[PDB]
Amino acid sequence: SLINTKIKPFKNQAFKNGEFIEVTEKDTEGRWSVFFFYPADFTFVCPTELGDVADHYEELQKLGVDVYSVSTDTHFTHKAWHSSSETIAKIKYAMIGDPTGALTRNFDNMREDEGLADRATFVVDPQGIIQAIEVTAEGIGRDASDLLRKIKAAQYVAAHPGEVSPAKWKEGEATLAPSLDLVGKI
Amino acid sequence: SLINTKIKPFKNQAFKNGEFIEVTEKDTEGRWSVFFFYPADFTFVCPTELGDVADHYEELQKLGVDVYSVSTDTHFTHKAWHSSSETIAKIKYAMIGDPTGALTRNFDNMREDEGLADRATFVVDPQGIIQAIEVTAEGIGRDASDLLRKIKAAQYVAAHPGEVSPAKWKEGEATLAPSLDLVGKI
Amino acid sequence: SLINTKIKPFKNQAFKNGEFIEVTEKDTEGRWSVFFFYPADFTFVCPTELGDVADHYEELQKLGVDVYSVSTDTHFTHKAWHSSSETIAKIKYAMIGDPTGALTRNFDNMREDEGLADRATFVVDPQGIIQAIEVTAEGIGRDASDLLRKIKAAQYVAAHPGEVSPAKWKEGEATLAPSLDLVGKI
Amino acid sequence: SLINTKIKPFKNQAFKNGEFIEVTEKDTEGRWSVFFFYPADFTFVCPTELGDVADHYEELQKLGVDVYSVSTDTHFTHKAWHSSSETIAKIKYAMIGDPTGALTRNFDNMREDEGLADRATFVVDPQGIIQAIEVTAEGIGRDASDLLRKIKAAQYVAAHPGEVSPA
Amino acid sequence: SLINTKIKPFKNQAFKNGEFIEVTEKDTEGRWSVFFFYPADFTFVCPTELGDVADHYEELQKLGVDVYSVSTDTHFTHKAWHSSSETIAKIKYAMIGDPTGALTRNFDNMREDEGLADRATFVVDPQGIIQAIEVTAEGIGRDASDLLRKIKAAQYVAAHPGEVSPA
Amino acid sequence: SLINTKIKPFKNQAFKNGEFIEVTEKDTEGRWSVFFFYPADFTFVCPTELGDVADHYEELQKLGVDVYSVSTDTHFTHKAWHSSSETIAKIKYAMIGDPTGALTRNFDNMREDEGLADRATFVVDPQGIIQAIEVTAEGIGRDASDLLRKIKAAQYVAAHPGEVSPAKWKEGEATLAPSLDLVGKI
Amino acid sequence: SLINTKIKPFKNQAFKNGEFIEVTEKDTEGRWSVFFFYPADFTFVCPTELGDVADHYEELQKLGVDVYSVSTDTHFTHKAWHSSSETIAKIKYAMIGDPTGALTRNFDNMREDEGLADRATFVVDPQGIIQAIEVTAEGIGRDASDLLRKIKAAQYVAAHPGEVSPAKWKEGEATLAPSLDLVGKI
Amino acid sequence: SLINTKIKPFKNQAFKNGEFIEVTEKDTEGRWSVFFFYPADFTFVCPTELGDVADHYEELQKLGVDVYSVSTDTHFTHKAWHSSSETIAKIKYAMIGDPTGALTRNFDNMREDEGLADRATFVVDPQGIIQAIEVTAEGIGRDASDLLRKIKAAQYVAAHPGEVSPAKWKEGEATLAPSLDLVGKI
Amino acid sequence: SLINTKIKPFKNQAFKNGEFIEVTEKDTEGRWSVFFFYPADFTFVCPTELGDVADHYEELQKLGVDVYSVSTDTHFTHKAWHSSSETIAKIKYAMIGDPTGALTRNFDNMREDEGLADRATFVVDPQGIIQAIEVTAEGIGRDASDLLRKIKAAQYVAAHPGEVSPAKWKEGEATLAPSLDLVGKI
Amino acid sequence: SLINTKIKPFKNQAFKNGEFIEVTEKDTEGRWSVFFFYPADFTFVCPTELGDVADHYEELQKLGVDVYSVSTDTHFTHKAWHSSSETIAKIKYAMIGDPTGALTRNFDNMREDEGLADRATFVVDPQGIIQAIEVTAEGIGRDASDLLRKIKAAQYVAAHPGEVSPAKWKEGEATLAPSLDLVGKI
Ligand SMILES: [K+]
Ligand SMILES: [K+]
Ligand SMILES: [K+]
Ligand SMILES: [K+]
Ligand SMILES: [K+]
Ligand SMILES: [K+]
């Protein structure tokens, strides 16, 4: 159960906007982060999901949220994919390579018989605590707008302790304030 | 992780539509199942998620999908809750009590600290295989619509093996077909 | 058995007279205590046993005895029961929730295959020593006035070391006295 | 606790009404039993817990309940006690000797630093199941009328499962 | 065997001449001791091993030898026995109770299946060393004059090492 | 202690009346036996104890008692001692050599830091059960006539089960008899 | 070292001249095989090495020698590289993808800290026995006919048992015939 | 594999041009080293291999490269071989004897069943790092200037960091300069 | 203590009268054997000892005694030594090579820090039982005439069980016949 | 093996020239020592070996050599034996008793089967190092002359480090000097 645990240290090469950079956990400290795992560069279902997040990246950045896509491919491969796919071309966040699989396994997200990461998305808060987890089968695409929903929910809860965001929570809704009075009445 | 793994045997008591029944893994064989974990009866956030799922329930039933809500409370407490809340009153799917924690630990979903289940939703296919997982922090509500989307998508890949449905996919829109030729092009 | 051993440290949430409080072993130090275990809130039997203790609680408090009921349900569930049942509504002592089972296991009183406590009562003195234990099967009532009797006896021996109370003692009766003057004769 | 578990096998010598007999768990089958433990024969207290049970023994026998007192003394010592104290002389139930401590540990009722049993009473139904347990410190008396009350309830729920007061 | 080893520490309650006392290994320091074990108070035999020691107790005291009888019964039970049997009533040495069995196991003298001590006698010198051991089955009597003979020899070799008969 | 346990199998060389023989536990079956241990051949003390047994050997043989002396010296050394010492020359019973120490350790009678047996005597009945043990320190003599006494007592109880011999018994005296007629009175 | 050992079983996906195939150890039986490992697709040193081999590939096929290149990238990635590099484009032999790293570890050829295979070349006979091994540092390129030189020599030895081939021999020059007294003579 | 690892310490006796010397890892520091392993003195294939190296030995010395041949025979035996074979006689580099097999196991080069080293050649840089490895079967001879080719290439890379040397390069031809976008370009 | 134990199986190559043969324990069965260990071919002290035995070999053979010299050198090396030393040249018995050290270690005779056998001589009877052992320091030569003495002693004892050969035993001397009569008189 | 190893500490009682003394490893420091093991006092073969050593004893003493005979018998038995045998009577070196077997097991020389030492002779130098070992079967006598030869040889190598004395060597004859040049020539 990795929900509500702190992410483990890591150090990986990544491709980001035409450069190779190093990313470590220190980059994520004090920031909101999305770790977006996918199985394989040059595949199919994967780009539309990565592109979709890219579509939301301007808004994520305005909200102080960084994004890291991760596969067991090399950063070298990411750079190539980025130049040959016009969907991937629009990605401006870090594409992390994890050929040792270390980062994938920190998140218990390896397909051990394929040596590829599972389709998993992790939301990590500025204290390194995992606040949301999504994992789907090889054939089921994720939904970046729902990802946005959860991040805003997580950010809200962080900013209003003692308050919570209910089912269907969206921008500006009545929230709940835990209390002795509210128990069993809803 | 538990993605793409088969669920483990269990035998639990439940409240369902005014009666106490036993539920086991055998009751799930050949059915789609959703296992919907939450931390505690009589709290605040929980009903809204549970009511929303109930709102989608005939539609889920029309899709051959069974719903099981699960907490570490007893079936007695579920029955009581069902009487005192207009929201919980709306529930016609089984409310499983897991006071030993065995069912919860089968899904690796226990807060050992607290003796309560985390907010996790699991989709399980007729072969017992977990096809989607969602876990969120205490303050972040799930969304039963996105749940349906994944289920519809899961059934689709089950029903159309060599094709996959990419992100945000809903009924009637275009699929991708993994093959050699398509490698690297979107 | 645990007779004449010291209670172990514990930390639990409780419902007590309309508020949530924390109880620890520090709350028992210097006080007499009754730990009153039972299997489950909201079952179908009338919670007569708990009501009987409530009936005697003013008197117990005058003897400086604190009462704690304990089950593996949450303090949230205790609050609900207390609103819904006329018998339970009489309770002004602390109702401890023990969903982790730690307090119940400290007193070796768990039904491990059910996740519920057995019907056991423990009398604990101000130094934390267990001075009396009672456990009964379902349907065999724990009598609150026998509880009072044992407590008054325990307080008496504490105040009068060198004297012991045989079977039969109630206030005003003869005591027995260390002697060498004494045996195979009585 | 041992509540709702089956008693373990045992074989002990006992004193009963002027003779020595052997008692085993086979003697408990089909019967209600009370196992009444205490620390020591020939001791400083008015043995009024045992006298109290004796006083109620006729009534217990009418309910088809057998009584066994148990301590870690020998059956030899029980016989001597029974023939020196007017209170013990009233006892007509079996006085089991448990010098190995085996029976006592079966009921998890040993004071290991003393080699004596704690003041525990156990009610056992005809299938060998423990339906009630009571343990007290040395200054706190076991009440025989409360025992009777509990035995009659145990027999009642046994013959009429299901009849308890709703909420 | 435990021959020529130092006795282990112990703390037991005893009956001695109408009072209860505590006995420990500190009580044996500087003294000769006989530890006389037996299985059970209030038993079927003429307790003539103990009576025999009593008969020789004055003489043993003149040799500066203390005697301790030991069984797994309580000191309580020893007191009762001493006040019911004319043979036991003759005993003026300490009757140690060993209900935990600790003292008995120190002398490796327990019948584990019975919870009773075997018929063993041990001679212990002023430095706590065991100089003689005797153990017998239940039908085979321990002779007190042979004990005296062995104690006087042990004291003699202790005061005069080196004087034994050549070959 | 080893009282009332069965002797263990053994196989040793012995010197007996001018010949070397083998002794095993099979030689003791159906016979009464004395195992007479001592530390060392050819020491400076007179082997009075062994001579005393030799003095009583004709009588012991009439009671059907076999005698075995045992030390950790060889049977070769026993032969030499027997030629050189007038006391030892009287011996017509078997002198077992135990250089491996196995027979001595079977009777738990080894001084492990010296490699020599302690001064111990064991009486063993025809079923191989040890009925009496005597161990003394150096200089404290084992009396052969006390040995005879214990043997006659052991044979008596064997022939008269239901009777036991108190301390004091020699042939012709009263016996004690199982009774219930009997105690705290004698 | 692994010289003169049998290769271990494996199952890998591969790219070859526009099709995806499964390669297993069974496909190498009764054939000579060259396993050509490299760290990473889309790099710099690697293509020059692979292309060098491709130049010689027909001559290798006439000798009944199959070539397998291997990296820890996926077969998907090989296909992409094959279409993007004019140098990689000339490869007509199988490019095996080894994302689990199993095939690489079988040949003990993993940089465990990096998740990439070392620059190693292995010659494997029709019976699966490794007959030649080469490994170079990241900066040192291999030489394609040194390989050829070693293969023909390996093949001649197999077909002419009882003879061994000395240093530097090229086709048509003399060999040594092992035994009794050439010893120490050459 | 051992490529790119530091050599382990060793201490061996050796024969060199009529003297016995002790060689240790200290003697290789700040020098380039070739370790030339072979199974057995007085054989057949071995001298042709060693003599081939001897032919090139001066050219190796001008490059500051020391040569060490190694077998599990003693240094005594090397001296004997050196005086009996005209081919071995031309060796002026150190012939190390490795009768314990330790040096051979350090390079993981033992035939454990035979007690002989395999036909392996190791190139070691001044910092002790193995930069090149070759192993051939019993019947396949090595090639002395392939070695030379690899050494100069190894040396050029060391003295010109940030550059790597592609396949087949001989003195005077062009090298590659690693980074950002030559990627996938050659 | 290997005296009086059976030799362990082995299989080694050996040089004997111009041929290479295989020797195993089966060769030694039913024969007397001498295993003559020495540290190293081409050394100094060793030849005179081996030559010395060679001087006695005709007589050893007449007595049905085979000889095996053993070192950790190869059989190849033995052949060479045999051709270059006129002392070794006169050896007509098997010279066993033990480069794995297996034979040396069967006899617990390895100098583990040198990988050479110690100076040990073992006499083995037709049942494989070791009847005599000699081992000396590096500087102390053995004496083949004493070896002859012992073999004849061993053969005698084998042929006359119940009889023994005393100190100084030589051809035709009074022997000793163990008996009860002889004990302690000599 | 124990060749060239240091002897272990011991503390034993002994008979020497009419008195009982203690012997430890400290008594051997700085002296040459011979440890002469035999199985049993009062037997047959043993005295002849022991008497012969005594015959050489002043000469051994003149060489600074101490003799210790050792059996698992006591010092008492040694003293007795010394009185009854004219051969043992001749002994003026220490006769150590080892009834615990510790001294014997230090030299790994126990027949565990029997509790007796094997016929072993050990030569130990002033530094505690074992320089020669001889072990023979029950029926094969040692020869004190060959013993002297080894000792004289051992002292020689001690006194002349770079030279060794070869087989059959006795005083005044030629030595060999290990050096480079001599390798392979005798
Ligand atoms: K990869
Ligand atoms: K619960
Ligand atoms: K007792
Ligand atoms: K007792
Ligand atoms: K060698
Ligand atoms: K011995």
JSON list of C-alpha atoms in Angstrom, two decimals, chain J residues 18-104:
[
{"chain": "J", "resi": 18, "resn": "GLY", "atom": "CA", "xyz": [60.47, -41.23, 39.98]},
{"chain": "J", "resi": 19, "resn": "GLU", "atom": "CA", "xyz": [58.31, -38.13, 40.39]},
{"chain": "J", "resi": 20, "resn": "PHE", "atom": "CA", "xyz": [55.02, -36.65, 39.35]},
{"chain": "J", "resi": 21, "resn": "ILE", "atom": "CA", "xyz": [55.32, -33.34, 37.57]},
{"chain": "J", "resi": 22, "resn": "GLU", "atom": "CA", "xyz": [53.12, -31.09, 35.49]},
{"chain": "J", "resi": 23, "resn": "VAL", "atom": "CA", "xyz": [54.04, -30.45, 31.84]},
{"chain": "J", "resi": 24, "resn": "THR", "atom": "CA", "xyz": [52.74, -27.59, 29.66]},
{"chain": "J", "resi": 25, "resn": "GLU", "atom": "CA", "xyz": [53.54, -26.11, 26.25]},
{"chain": "J", "resi": 26, "resn": "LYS", "atom": "CA", "xyz": [55.60, -23.52, 28.15]},
{"chain": "J", "resi": 27, "resn": "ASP", "atom": "CA", "xyz": [58.06, -26.26, 29.14]},
{"chain": "J", "resi": 28, "resn": "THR", "atom": "CA", "xyz": [58.72, -26.85, 25.45]},
{"chain": "J", "resi": 29, "resn": "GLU", "atom": "CA", "xyz": [59.37, -23.23, 24.49]},
{"chain": "J", "resi": 30, "resn": "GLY", "atom": "CA", "xyz": [62.89, -22.79, 23.17]},
{"chain": "J", "resi": 31, "resn": "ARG", "atom": "CA", "xyz": [63.58, -26.51, 23.13]},
{"chain": "J", "resi": 32, "resn": "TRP", "atom": "CA", "xyz": [63.36, -29.20, 20.53]},
{"chain": "J", "resi": 33, "resn": "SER", "atom": "CA", "xyz": [60.65, -31.61, 21.55]},
{"chain": "J", "resi": 34, "resn": "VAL", "atom": "CA", "xyz": [59.57, -35.06, 20.51]},
{"chain": "J", "resi": 35, "resn": "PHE", "atom": "CA", "xyz": [56.04, -36.06, 21.30]},
{"chain": "J", "resi": 36, "resn": "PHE", "atom": "CA", "xyz": [55.86, -39.88, 21.19]},
{"chain": "J", "resi": 37, "resn": "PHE", "atom": "CA", "xyz": [52.27, -41.21, 21.31]},
{"chain": "J", "resi": 38, "resn": "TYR", "atom": "CA", "xyz": [51.34, -44.84, 21.88]},
{"chain": "J", "resi": 39, "resn": "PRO", "atom": "CA", "xyz": [48.04, -46.61, 22.60]},
{"chain": "J", "resi": 40, "resn": "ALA", "atom": "CA", "xyz": [48.32, -48.33, 25.98]},
{"chain": "J", "resi": 41, "resn": "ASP", "atom": "CA", "xyz": [50.52, -49.07, 29.03]},
{"chain": "J", "resi": 42, "resn": "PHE", "atom": "CA", "xyz": [50.90, -52.82, 29.86]},
{"chain": "J", "resi": 43, "resn": "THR", "atom": "CA", "xyz": [50.60, -54.03, 26.32]},
{"chain": "J", "resi": 44, "resn": "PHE", "atom": "CA", "xyz": [53.20, -55.79, 24.08]},
{"chain": "J", "resi": 45, "resn": "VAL", "atom": "CA", "xyz": [54.65, -53.80, 21.13]},
{"chain": "J", "resi": 46, "resn": "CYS", "atom": "CA", "xyz": [54.82, -50.42, 22.88]},
{"chain": "J", "resi": 47, "resn": "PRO", "atom": "CA", "xyz": [57.83, -50.96, 25.25]},
{"chain": "J", "resi": 48, "resn": "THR", "atom": "CA", "xyz": [60.20, -51.92, 22.49]},
{"chain": "J", "resi": 49, "resn": "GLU", "atom": "CA", "xyz": [59.62, -48.59, 20.71]},
{"chain": "J", "resi": 50, "resn": "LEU", "atom": "CA", "xyz": [59.80, -46.71, 24.04]},
{"chain": "J", "resi": 51, "resn": "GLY", "atom": "CA", "xyz": [62.95, -48.53, 25.21]},
{"chain": "J", "resi": 52, "resn": "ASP", "atom": "CA", "xyz": [64.71, -47.82, 21.96]},
{"chain": "J", "resi": 53, "resn": "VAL", "atom": "CA", "xyz": [64.01, -44.11, 22.30]},
{"chain": "J", "resi": 54, "resn": "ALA", "atom": "CA", "xyz": [65.35, -44.25, 25.87]},
{"chain": "J", "resi": 55, "resn": "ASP", "atom": "CA", "xyz": [68.49, -45.88, 24.43]},
{"chain": "J", "resi": 56, "resn": "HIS", "atom": "CA", "xyz": [68.98, -42.76, 22.33]},
{"chain": "J", "resi": 57, "resn": "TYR", "atom": "CA", "xyz": [68.12, -40.40, 25.10]},
{"chain": "J", "resi": 58, "resn": "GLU", "atom": "CA", "xyz": [71.43, -38.92, 26.32]},
{"chain": "J", "resi": 59, "resn": "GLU", "atom": "CA", "xyz": [72.33, -38.38, 22.72]},
{"chain": "J", "resi": 60, "resn": "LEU", "atom": "CA", "xyz": [68.96, -36.64, 22.25]},
{"chain": "J", "resi": 61, "resn": "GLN", "atom": "CA", "xyz": [69.55, -34.61, 25.43]},
{"chain": "J", "resi": 62, "resn": "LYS", "atom": "CA", "xyz": [73.02, -33.70, 24.12]},
{"chain": "J", "resi": 63, "resn": "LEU", "atom": "CA", "xyz": [71.21, -32.25, 21.09]},
{"chain": "J", "resi": 64, "resn": "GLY", "atom": "CA", "xyz": [68.88, -30.21, 23.30]},
{"chain": "J", "resi": 65, "resn": "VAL", "atom": "CA", "xyz": [65.95, -32.51, 22.55]},
{"chain": "J", "resi": 66, "resn": "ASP", "atom": "CA", "xyz": [63.28, -33.31, 25.14]},
{"chain": "J", "resi": 67, "resn": "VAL", "atom": "CA", "xyz": [61.26, -36.46, 24.89]},
{"chain": "J", "resi": 68, "resn": "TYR", "atom": "CA", "xyz": [57.63, -36.83, 25.97]},
{"chain": "J", "resi": 69, "resn": "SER", "atom": "CA", "xyz": [55.87, -40.19, 25.69]},
{"chain": "J", "resi": 70, "resn": "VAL", "atom": "CA", "xyz": [52.08, -39.92, 25.69]},
{"chain": "J", "resi": 71, "resn": "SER", "atom": "CA", "xyz": [49.16, -42.33, 26.23]},
{"chain": "J", "resi": 72, "resn": "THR", "atom": "CA", "xyz": [45.59, -41.95, 27.43]},
{"chain": "J", "resi": 73, "resn": "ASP", "atom": "CA", "xyz": [46.59, -43.79, 30.64]},
{"chain": "J", "resi": 74, "resn": "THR", "atom": "CA", "xyz": [47.18, -41.88, 33.89]},
{"chain": "J", "resi": 75, "resn": "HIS", "atom": "CA", "xyz": [50.55, -40.86, 35.32]},
{"chain": "J", "resi": 76, "resn": "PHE", "atom": "CA", "xyz": [49.84, -43.46, 38.04]},
{"chain": "J", "resi": 77, "resn": "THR", "atom": "CA", "xyz": [49.68, -46.15, 35.42]},
{"chain": "J", "resi": 78, "resn": "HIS", "atom": "CA", "xyz": [52.91, -44.90, 33.89]},
{"chain": "J", "resi": 79, "resn": "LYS", "atom": "CA", "xyz": [54.60, -45.04, 37.28]},
{"chain": "J", "resi": 80, "resn": "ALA", "atom": "CA", "xyz": [53.34, -48.59, 37.88]},
{"chain": "J", "resi": 81, "resn": "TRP", "atom": "CA", "xyz": [54.45, -49.74, 34.45]},
{"chain": "J", "resi": 82, "resn": "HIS", "atom": "CA", "xyz": [57.90, -48.26, 35.12]},
{"chain": "J", "resi": 83, "resn": "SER", "atom": "CA", "xyz": [58.18, -50.45, 38.18]},
{"chain": "J", "resi": 84, "resn": "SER", "atom": "CA", "xyz": [57.11, -53.70, 36.68]},
{"chain": "J", "resi": 85, "resn": "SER", "atom": "CA", "xyz": [58.90, -53.59, 33.32]},
{"chain": "J", "resi": 86, "resn": "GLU", "atom": "CA", "xyz": [62.70, -53.70, 32.92]},
{"chain": "J", "resi": 87, "resn": "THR", "atom": "CA", "xyz": [62.25, -52.03, 29.55]},
{"chain": "J", "resi": 88, "resn": "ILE", "atom": "CA", "xyz": [60.02, -49.16, 30.80]},
{"chain": "J", "resi": 89, "resn": "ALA", "atom": "CA", "xyz": [62.38, -48.88, 33.83]},
{"chain": "J", "resi": 90, "resn": "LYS", "atom": "CA", "xyz": [65.02, -47.59, 31.47]},
{"chain": "J", "resi": 91, "resn": "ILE", "atom": "CA", "xyz": [62.98, -44.48, 30.68]},
{"chain": "J", "resi": 92, "resn": "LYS", "atom": "CA", "xyz": [64.28, -41.17, 31.99]},
{"chain": "J", "resi": 93, "resn": "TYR", "atom": "CA", "xyz": [62.15, -38.81, 29.87]},
{"chain": "J", "resi": 94, "resn": "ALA", "atom": "CA", "xyz": [58.64, -37.68, 30.94]},
{"chain": "J", "resi": 95, "resn": "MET", "atom": "CA", "xyz": [55.72, -40.06, 30.61]},
{"chain": "J", "resi": 96, "resn": "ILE", "atom": "CA", "xyz": [52.67, -37.92, 30.14]},
{"chain": "J", "resi": 97, "resn": "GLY", "atom": "CA", "xyz": [49.22, -39.17, 31.08]},
{"chain": "J", "resi": 98, "resn": "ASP", "atom": "CA", "xyz": [46.39, -37.87, 28.95]},
{"chain": "J", "resi": 99, "resn": "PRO", "atom": "CA", "xyz": [43.27, -39.36, 30.38]},
{"chain": "J", "resi": 100, "resn": "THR", "atom": "CA", "xyz": [41.05, -36.48, 29.04]},
{"chain": "J", "resi": 101, "resn": "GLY", "atom": "CA", "xyz": [42.42, -36.98, 25.56]},
{"chain": "J", "resi": 102, "resn": "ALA", "atom": "CA", "xyz": [43.08, -33.23, 25.16]},
{"chain": "J", "resi": 103, "resn": "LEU", "atom": "CA", "xyz": [46.74, -33.54, 24.40]},
{"chain": "J", "resi": 104, "resn": "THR", "atom": "CA", "xyz": [46.09, -36.34, 21.96]}
]
